[PDB]
DNA sequence: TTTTGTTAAGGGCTGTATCACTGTGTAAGACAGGC
DNA sequence: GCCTGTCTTACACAGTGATACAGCCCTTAACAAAA
DNA sequence: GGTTTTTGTCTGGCTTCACACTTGATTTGCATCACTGTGTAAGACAGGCCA
DNA sequence: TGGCCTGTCTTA
DNA sequence: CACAGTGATGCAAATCAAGTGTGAAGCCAGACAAAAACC
């Protein structure tokens, strides 16, 4: 399958939010990565899901 | 070692094959198949792998990923597939996926063995009187002997079935899980075998026609566990009930017949012999291996499931048009009309058989219609002990064809008019049916049903019908009359009612007197010497009734579906085996053990 | 039993085994005692003959994944005839009781029918057909084709359900596609060549007798089914497909069901005439469809076989099967072809029989009747359907034995001396004939005429028998070589392939049922009355005609629609909802994807 | 030095090819009304 | 020197659950061929 | 009584899952739809014996 | 020649 | 009349997919003694 456009953009954004708090839990990272995007500019992370969903569908 | 193919890993092993099969030859008695797997579970379980320890030990117990031939035989039998559409689907899911997650037919071919009716072993203490011992016993010819020589009566009959008593084993069997548990639940031993009681419905239906295309009429004699308690001290425990009683699922077929219901010579001839069956049980004690523990069981038969017509045929009866309308009573159309309500359970097997032989030796020489009304009705001999009840929908349908004629009269006021022509009262059926119309939504219908009976008796449709009655006087007794069937209905209608409406329980019976009271005062005009067995049977029985089996409710029309679908697409197309095959389908697919598998999704 | 003990207990008893395999590990194995454990058992339960429990112990150490493809669910649901509900009863318990999902939802399923049936896939026809729309999500359509139903109009008293022509090739091409590109590996071609295909197409159409599930209900269908499809590649056509087993149900794709009369010319024309305004129009276009990523064009040709006579004659305005004009493919009459056995050709076609249909009409040269139609030759009315009507090897057969059982029982009587015979000398005769055929060839006798009867009378064998029972040897010259004949003319109309497998049967078959048809005049006047079956014309007169018309006889046969009629009804009852305008859809959507080559791959998987 | 094939005689599961059997569709004939 | 439905069974085959038969991979030792 | 077994006891340091949290676009679960054919029994209806 | 008591057939 | 049982339908609720650090759960080893059946 492939991944959502915030699934996409949160596997970017783990090194911005991993470098300034190292310790964060997963449910902390998440949480954080989810309320900030949330809030969110984000239409290039659309894009790129929806070429990676056509490319999948091609896929047999 | 595992990149390797076969001879390979062989050759590179064999060393250590023959060290392994010397120390499992020296010290197991050569089992290597024990050794090796206890190996490799210890081995998966001390590196942690639970996971794949726990999926090889489902794989050994047949859990996961293979289905076990008894949960294959569920699947076939419930989706009614053929053997060579199940081998289709078999053949076709292990060629595409490698594995064989259904089972070979032969696999389900064993399976069904158990399931079937003379694989367990039992006793009876004492042996049955006129039944075989032989345990081994399962689908036997439904004429049992008949003769079938040119000479002797034609037999234009084939039919099959199970002996009772080897049934019972296979049904006890099948819910053997359920008894257990429900053992555990009462907070009992596993290992208790203190005398069991089984009380079992006993049943028999018509199923119509049968043809695939003449008619072809079949009668499917079956029963029903109802109830299994366990004696601990001197309290009977019950450790199984049929939540279901009445369902197609749990009605284990006993015999199946291509014959008509009236069809009284053939009847008797091939339900006899499960009748000489069942008196046997009626006095031995059944013995029976549980969990590796001999179990006791003893049996009470209860035949309730019986509409009107084959208890009359059974019980020596006449026909439904006979003044005698009760099967429980000696009534008469005429007394039961004017006696509204003090009537008594008097009848018997046994009251019927010496009526029928009183009029068999009209012993005090009376004529044909002074006899008849000494036997009440009984000109034929009984040959089945039956539990007439009644039908909750039977009461509801009584008690709304009563009130919808009383709404018609009271619109027409047939108390001013006792030369009313035909027509006029037509009128005021029709004023009736246009005014329920349009305030109640209620379509007239010229058939009396349950639904237009659950819709018609409440107290707004009394309101409604009252817009159009003058007098308010009867106004207060139409919505009195009401009120009162709304207190009676429950009783009726729940499948418990000494707990679930205990209060209208104990007033059923002023409720019931108070009721025909007021039909007989204020509703004179609706009484002409007629009524309905059912009528009859709600007024004056119902208590008696709730007393003896405990519930309305509790005591077939897809049984013709049914039976069909099986003859058409699981049977050999012979006469010889389709009924075979039919019976054997019908007993699989009433099994408690497969219909589990069946909900395994809860 | 050690597996009666706890993991302790088994431990301990073990403990001795469980050091010597460490040992044996780490000195051959590298210390894997997991894989040497693993396989010890896996070949200790292949040694008990137990290979289910290795194999699935295998499966699940590879941890290979059991999961049936939605496709491959809806192969099985269809070809084992389960309903929806039946389905998902079996699905939510294996499901339930494995915790896998190896069968896939009901939902999945019809998704992966959407792309089985019509109107799944783009394509594009140059030019663009004429009167057929251009657009290709059409899937199934109302039979009527907007057939007027108000009060006033004539009564509508049929439900029918179709396909657009194109729109169906479209779904069976696209159906066959694996079968193509393996075909054009077969044949030494590239997957990705585009050249044009050429689909030779059978058209065909039958009545299913009656349907009612218990008055009668009459069904009709309008099929077609590929043949073969070659490809250009020089000035050659090469095979890259040909239906194994072309009279099959399995390949027979319908077109349009509807619960009419194949007898009501008014419905039958009234609901056919679209469909044969699509196939027109597609003579005169190249399709251009995408498989395997490459666009490829198609030409098609359809040849009107699927025809029995009553059909034929219905459609082509000739006159119903009683008529003096015994042939659909010639003008003969039923005397003109007794006295006249073999010479007789292939004269009839569709645009001939519109043209005498013209001139029955307009009755140009002021005829009576009688002399109209003698001029116009039966065509009374008005063709339809231009058909290729033929013969099944079958009737050949038929039309032969039924004439040697009467010589052989005239032959019994010696009426080549005698002419007259009573009705008990005559009945005497066949009675001989009956019982040494039961005692010396093993035949019953038959009450009325068939096949294998004929197969196995038709034989040298039975010659000799027959000639136990007559005296004079210059009759039994005259049997076997009248056998001898037949034995030369039969290959042609029996194989499959006639210009391959018998070249010479074929190139002889003419000169042979000329001195057949000379030795039964010369030596067997007596079996002349001026009457003849249209099989036997038609064995004598036209086939080699047929046979270069069509290549082959025995392959156009009438044989496999006798399933049909069971077929439907078993959708009608278990896959079809229960209300008139739908059951007929759901009939025809479950014949469809019955067809499809795609599933019934999956349902032969393990060959 | 490590993987597989191989021989021969022969022993169980499994797959499919029938059994026997009858209903049933289709069609080969027979037949009778056109008062 | 008729036409044309209706009627009647012959007939083949479909398709059932049971059953019989064949083919399956092995199981003993040893050489040894490919790698 | 001796001679054989089952099944515990005490630790930790290990290995192998399940859960933790988010977002939103897929996928499943489940009850429902509209709809007629068929069985069944409620209820018209034909009927012949005797006065 | 009936009511009409009984058993068969019909339709919702 | 009711109702059986068809394929379609529609909406709610799982589910997936990624990150990884936990906690829980079960197992190991070796000298040895309870609670138990075998001569
Ligand atoms: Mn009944
Ligand atoms: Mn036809
Ligand atoms: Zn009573
Ligand atoms: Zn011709």
Same mark, same amino acid.
């Given at each position: ?17 991993? @470098?300034?708090?190292? @310790?964060?839990?997963?449910? &902390?990272?998440?949480?954080?990565? @989810? ?5 969110? &500019? ?16 091609? &896929?047999? | ?20 099969? =010397? ?23 001390? %590196? ?10 489902? #794989? ?14 569920? #699947? ?57 011992? %032989? ?30 008593? $080897? ?8 819910m053997?899980?359920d008894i257990?548990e429900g053992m555990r639940s009462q907070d009992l031993?596993?290992?208790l075998?203190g005398p069991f009681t089984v009380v ?25 566990v109802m109830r299994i308690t366990i004696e601990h001290?001197?309290q009977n425990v019950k450790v199984f009930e049929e939540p279901?009683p ?38 031995? =004690? ?8 001999? /179990?006791?069981?003893?049996?009470i ?16 009866? =006449? ?45 005090? !020489?009376?004529?044909?219609? =002074? ?25 509801? #349908? ?18 001013? !008019? ?18 329920? /119309? ?8 010229? %058939? ?26 009867? !106004? ?8 009162? +069937? ?6 009726? /209608?729940?499948?418990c009612?000494?707990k ?26 609706? +009484? ?22 405990g $519930? ?11 039976? /069909? ?38």
């Amino acid at each position: 399958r492939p991944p959502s456009a915030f699934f996409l953009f949160c596997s970017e954004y783990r090194p911005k939010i991993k @470098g300034e708090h190292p @310790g964060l839990s997963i449910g &902390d990272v998440a949480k954080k990565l @989810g309320e900030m995007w949330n809030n969110t &500019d984000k239409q290039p992370y659309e894009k790129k899901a929806a070429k990676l969903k056509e490319k999948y569908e091609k &896929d047999i | 070692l595992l990149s390797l193919t076969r001879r390979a890993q062989k050759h590179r092993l064999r060393e250590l094959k023959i060290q392994v099969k =010397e120390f499992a030859d020296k010290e197991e008695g050569g089992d290597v198949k024990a050794v090796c797997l206890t190996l490799f579970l210890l081995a998966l379980r001390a %590196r942690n792998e639970h996971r794949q320890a726990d999926e090889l030990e489902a #794989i050994m117990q047949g859990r996961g990923s293979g289905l076990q031939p008894a949960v294959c035989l569920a #699947i076939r039998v419930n989706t009614f597939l053929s053997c060579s559409q199940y081998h289709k689907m078999y053949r076709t899911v292990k060629a595409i996926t490698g594995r064989q997650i259904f089972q070979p037919l032969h696999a389900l071919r064993n399976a069904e063995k158990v399931l079937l009716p003379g694989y367990h072993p039992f006793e009876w203490q004492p042996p049955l009187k006129n039944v075989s011992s %032989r345990t081994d016993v399962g689908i036997i010819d439904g004429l049992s002997g008949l003769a079938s020589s040119v000479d002797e009566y034609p037999v234009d009959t084939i039919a099959k079935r199970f002996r009772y008593d $080897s049934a019972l084993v296979s049904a006890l069997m099948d819910m053997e899980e359920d008894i257990l548990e429900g053992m555990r639940s009462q907070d009992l031993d596993d290992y208790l075998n203190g005398p069991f009681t089984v009380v079992v419905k006993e049943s028999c239906d018509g199923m119509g026609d049968v043809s695939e295309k003449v008619p072809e009429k079949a009668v499917r004699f079956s029963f029903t566990v109802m109830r299994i308690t366990i004696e601990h001290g001197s309290q009977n425990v019950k450790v199984f009930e049929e939540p279901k009683p009445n369902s197609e699922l749990c009605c284990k077929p006993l015999c199946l017949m291509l014959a008509d219901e009236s069809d009284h010579e053939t009847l008797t001839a091939i339900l006899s012999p499960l009748i000489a069956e069942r008196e046997a049980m009626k006095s031995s =004690e059944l013995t029976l291996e549980m969990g590796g523990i001999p /179990r006791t069981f003893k049996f009470i038969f209860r035949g309730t499931g019986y509409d009107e017509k084959l208890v009359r045929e059974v019980e020596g009866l =006449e026909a439904s048009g006979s003044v005698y309308i009760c099967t429980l009573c000696d009534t008469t159309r005429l007394e039961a009309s004017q006696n509204l309500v003090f009537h008594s359970i008097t009848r018997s097997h046994a009251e019927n058989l010496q009526r029928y032989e009183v009029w068999r030796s009209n012993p005090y !020489h009376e004529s044909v219609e =002074e006899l008849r009304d000494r036997v009440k009705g009984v000109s034929a001999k009984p040959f089945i002990e039956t539990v007439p009840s009644i039908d909750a929908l039977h009461c509801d #349908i009584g008690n709304a064809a009563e009130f919808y004629k009383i709404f018609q009269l009271e619109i027409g006021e047939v108390y001013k !008019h006792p030369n009313a022509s035909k027509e006029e009262r037509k009128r005021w059926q029709a004023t009736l049916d246009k005014h329920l /119309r349009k305030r109640m939504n209620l379509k007239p219908i010229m %058939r009396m049903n349950g639904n237009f009976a659950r819709k018609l008796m409440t107290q707004e449709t009394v309101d409604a019908v009252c817009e159009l009655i003058p007098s308010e006087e009867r !106004h207060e007794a139409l919505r009195e009359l009401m009120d009162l +069937y709304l207190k009676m209905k429950p009783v009726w /209608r729940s499948s418990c009612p000494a707990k679930e409406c205990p209060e209208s329980l104990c007033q059923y019976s002023f409720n019931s007197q108070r009721f025909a009271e007021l039909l007989s005062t204020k509703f004179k005009y609706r +009484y002409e010497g007629k009524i309905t067995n059912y009528f009859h049977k709600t007024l004056a029985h119902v208590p008696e009734i709730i007393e003896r089996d405990g $519930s309305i409710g509790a005591w077939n029309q897809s049984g013709n579906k049914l039976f /069909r679908r099986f003859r058409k697409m699981n049977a050999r197309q012979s006469k010889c085996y389709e009924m075979e095959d039919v019976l054997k389908h019908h007993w699989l697919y009433t099994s408690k053990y497969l219909q589990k598998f069946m909900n395994a999704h809860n």
